[PDB]
Amino acid sequence: DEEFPEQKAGEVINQPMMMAARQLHDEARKWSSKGNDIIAAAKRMALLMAEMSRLVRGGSGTKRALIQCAKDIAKASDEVTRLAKEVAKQCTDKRIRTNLLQVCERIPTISTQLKILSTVKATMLDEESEQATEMLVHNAQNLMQSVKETVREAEAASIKIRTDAGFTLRWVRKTP
């Protein structure tokens, strides 16, 4: 439901991070969140990443905010991972299932590293600092990508489902 926080004028923001959040948000906003926790966790993440684009520079009084942001992002990643596994378990399709399983392996690595990088960046709030930022932005972009890809493999996995199953993500478009 919620909207993407447009970048206000005279706002210091990591544009690479904001753009990638914007696109992850765009992909997810195509689906109603009703009956689909992956789509809801995706929207949540896009928004947290938008906030993090405002935190990398941030400056005074933003360390906790940054470490907390990374924390909530990781929590959302965990939920997306967990739901993708369950979707995969019931996928009949060999290829779709393989792809799905691939990301449920990648996402945890990325989210663990985002937490490490967020923290090492918080201790710096210079070349070294600037590198801490670039490492974080690179990682965050990998996260936005994996999640976008997860949204799509899981939507394709809802086309060909198992008959003996107890699980269902609802995939209904949102029309403007």
Partner: peptide, 28 residues
């Protein structure tokens, strides 16, 4: 295409993760 992670070995990641977890509380 998939870009590699910042920490490229399991060892680098596993040793730093807990150090950063502990450090995070100190930072807060």
């Amino acid at each position: 295409h998939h870009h590699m992670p910042v920490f490229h070995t399991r060892t680098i990641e596993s040793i730093l993760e807990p150090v950063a977890q502990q450090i995070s509380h100190l930072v807060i």
